[PDB]
């Protein structure tokens, strides 16, 4: 199977392995011509990600911060 369209977007990549334990912050990136890409912090892993926003503790978390 072919690659995704070009790369503009900050998040592009979702590991989904995540877990608000080994997370160590949240943050959201406001793009214009993107939509609302939630991206993280690992702890365990010590970087940067985007979160799954179907993951199970971040169904909670997006259903605080919106629904």
Same mark, same amino acid.
């Given at each position: 199977k072919?690659?995704?369209l070009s790369y503009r977007c900050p998040c592009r990549f979702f590991e989904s392995?995540?877990?608000?334990?080994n997370v160590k912050h949240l943050k959201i990136l406001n793009t214009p011509n993107? +939509? !609302?890409?939630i991206v993280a912090r690992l702890k365990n892993n010590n970087r940067?990600?985007?979160?799954?926003?179907?993951?199970?503790?971040?169904?909670?978390?997006?259903?605080? +911060? !919106?629904n």
């Open positions: 072919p690659v995704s392995h995540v877990a608000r334990a993107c +939509a !609302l890409q940067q990600v985007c979160i799954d926003p179907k993951l199970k503790w971040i169904q909670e978390y997006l259903e605080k +911060a !919106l």
